[PDB]
Amino acid sequence: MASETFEFQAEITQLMSLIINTVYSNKEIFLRELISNASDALDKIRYKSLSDPKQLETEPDLFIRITPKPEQKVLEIRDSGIGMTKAELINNLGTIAKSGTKAFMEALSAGADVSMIGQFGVGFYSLFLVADRVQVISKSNDDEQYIWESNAGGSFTVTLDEVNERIGRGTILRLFLKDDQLEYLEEKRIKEVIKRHSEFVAYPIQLVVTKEVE
Q: Which residue of 12, 31, 38, 193 would you call a contact of ligand XD6, by CB under 6 A?
A: 38
Q: CA-CA distance, 160 to 139, in Å (whole number)? A: 11
Q: Considering beta carbons, is residue 33 or 108 the nearer one to a copy of itself?
A: 33
Backbone CA torsion sign across 142, 89, 43, 172: positive
Spatial neighbors of 68 by CB under 8 A, at least 6 apart, are 74, 75, 76, 184, 185, 186, 187, 190, 208, 209, 210
Least Cβ distance, residue 63 to a copy of itself (angstroms) = 9
Q: SS3 of 65, please?
A: strand
6 assigned binding-site residue: no
Q: Which residue of 165, 180, 188, 200 would you call a contact of a copy of itself, by CB under 8 A?
A: 165
Binding map of ligand XD6 across residues 55-94, x = CB under 6 A, - = no contact: ------------------------x-xxxx-------x--
Q: Considering beta carbons, is residue 19 or 205 the nearer one to a copy of itself?
A: 205
Q: Which does 61 bind (CB under 5 to 8 A by kind): ligand XD6, a copy of itself, none?
A: a copy of itself
153 preceded by a cis bond (ω within 30 of 0): no
Q: CA-CA distance, 177 to 70, in Å (whole number)? A: 10
Annotated binding site for ATP: 33, 37, 79, 84, 92, 98-100, 119-124, 171
